[PDB]
């Protein structure tokens, strides 16, 4: 169990997923503002490890890459502080749904 | 935009990823003390929303689902507190290296002769 490699890989996976989220937000925002570019961006994007995506966008439309950069970072800065509790308590509760499900099934059988 | 959904969906993805990562380390803790079980687990596993994965393992080998449950929770406990800084600063750096790459290129072009 390489706890330090797991953390690295998790952080990476999260940066990439938030770039993804930054990508749909701007897609939306550009659906209402400049639908020709919005379609282009829809068109451009399919396939994204978040860093490789942005690097590719930067060559085509720099100002557009900057904007994904701004959003992914504004999103991260807003949600980050909640991640630990959500995930630790989320796993703990979900761990517990399963044991309680198993106990009901067990109790439904034995007591019927 | 919908920050509340984004946080929920991020958490859920994270939670799924850590289950996946829990699987890898038990898969390898057994790789030692039981290759039949290991291969069984390996075979069963290919194809992975982490809660649906565990609910399915629970019907075949409850004790093995419980072990994944325990390892997933342990991993999260250990790494969770670092994640906020790692993501916020990882993005800020990667953002910044992207501006510096662009500057250095501009610099390479305007100044080279």
Contacts of B17 in chain A (CB under 8 A): 10, 13
Q: In chain A, after which residues does the backbone break, taking C–N over 2.5 angstroms as a break?
A: 47
Query: Quick check: A59 contacting B, CB < 8 Å?
Result: no
Contacts of B10 in chain A (CB under 8 A): 14, 17-18, 21, 79, 83
Reference A55, options A21, A16, A29; nearest CA is A16
Tell me the shortest Cα–Cα distance from A100 to chain B, in angstroms.
12
- Count of pairs with CB atoms under 8 A, one residue in A, one in B: 138
Q: What count of other Cβ atoms lies within 10 Å of the Cβ of residue A38?
A: 17
Query: Quick check: A103 contacting B, CB < 8 Å?
Result: no
Method for structure elucidation: X-ray
Helices (H), chain B: 3-33, 35-45, 50-60, 62-79, 83-111
Radius of gyration of chain A (CA): 21
Q: What are the structural domain ranges in chain A?
A: 1-112
CATH classification of A1-112 is 1.10.1200.210, yes or no?
Answer: yes
Alpha carbon distance B25, B72 (integer Å): 10
Query: Quick check: B51 contacting A, CB < 8 Å?
Result: yes
Instruction: Give the contacts of A22 (CB within 8 A, at least 6 positions apart).
Output: A68, A69, A71, A72, A75
Q: What is the CATH number of domain B1-113?
A: 1.10.1200.210
- Match 């250095």 to its residue by tokens: B104
Tokens of A66: 């900057």
Tell me the shortest Cα–Cα distance from A37 to chain B, in angstroms.
19
Alpha carbon distance A66, B98 (integer Å): 9
Residue A74, SS3?
helix
């Amino acid at each position: 169990m390489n706890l330090k490699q797991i953390a690295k890989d998790t952080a990476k996976t999260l940066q990439s997923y938030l770039t993804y989220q930054a990508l749909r937000t701007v897609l939306a925002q550009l659906g209402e503002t400049n639908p020709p570019l919005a379609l282009w961006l829809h068109n451009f994007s399919a396939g994204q490890d978040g860093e490789k995506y942005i690097e590719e966008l930067f060559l085509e439309k720099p100002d557009l890459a900057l904007r994904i950069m701004t959003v992914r970072e504004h999103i991260a800065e807003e949600i980050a502080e909640f991640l630990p509790e959500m995930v630790v308590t989320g796993i703990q509760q979900a761990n517990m749904e399963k044991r309680r499900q198993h106990l009901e099934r067990m109790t439904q059988v034995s007591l019927s």
